Amino acid sequence: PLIVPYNLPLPGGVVPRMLITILGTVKPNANRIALDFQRGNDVAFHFNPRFNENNRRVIVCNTKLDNNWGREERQSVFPFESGKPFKIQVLVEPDHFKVAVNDAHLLQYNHRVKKLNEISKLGISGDIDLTSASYTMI
Ligand SMILES: OC[C@H]1O[C@@H](S[C@@H]2O[C@H](CO)[C@H](O)[C@H](O)[C@H]2O)[C@H](O)[C@@H](O)[C@H]1O
Ligand SMILES: [Cl-]
Ligand SMILES: [Cl-]
Ligand SMILES: [Cl-]
Numbered sequence: 001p002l003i004v005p006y007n008l009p010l011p012g013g014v015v016p017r018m019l020i021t022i023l024g025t026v027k028p029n030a031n032r033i034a035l036d037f038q039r040g041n042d043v044a045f046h047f048n049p050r051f052n053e054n055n056r057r058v059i060v061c062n063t064k065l066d067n068n069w070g071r072e073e074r075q076s077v078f079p080f081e082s083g084k085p086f087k088i089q090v091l092v093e094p095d096h097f098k099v100a101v102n103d104a105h106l107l108q109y110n111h112r113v114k115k116l117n118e119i120s121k122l123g124i125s126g127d128i129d130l131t132s133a134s135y136t137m138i
């Protein structure tokens with residue numbers, strides 16, 4: 001088991017055909033999960049499931065540049081459940097991050113930060129027990 005918040009270095013940044021796999025379990029009565037792909041202080045891709053935003057479950061995606069959040073992209077398809085184990089896979093493609101949860105496609109997020117080789121750390125936080133965080137090339 002890993003301690004949350006967890007920082008996974010991505011040596012030399014991300015590259016198309018890099019696959020990041022995160023395994024864990026959502027805690028009971030969870031409020032949030034966040035994956036933050038960082039370029040220094042900037043957040044290239046924030047993936048943020050929210051379990052209770054105005055009594056709705058929603059996934060918020062965004063980018064933070066110079067300490068300012070941009071336009072949110074929201075997804076109402078919500079594959080997570082409190083108490084249950086999950087697998088998140090993030091596949092880096094030339095023009096998008098592609099996210100699958102529990103082997104089902106969820107969403108894609110167009111690259112706003114374009115210096116892919118400078119996105120060199122992934123922060124994982126929120127109301128989860130973290131089992132594994134790794135990457136490979138496909
Ligand atoms: O966009 C991701 C960040 O969202 C904010 S919450 C955010 O607040 C603005 C007002 O500034 C609007 O109400 C949005 O509807 C709302 O989603 C979080 O505080 C950050 O941690 C990011 O998750
Ligand atoms: Cl949140
Ligand atoms: Cl970084
Ligand atoms: Cl839930």
Ligand SMILES: [Cl-]
Nearest residue numbers: 093094095096
């Ligand atoms: Cl693409």
Ligand SMILES: [Cl-]
Nearest residue numbers: 112113114115
């Ligand atoms: Cl950039």
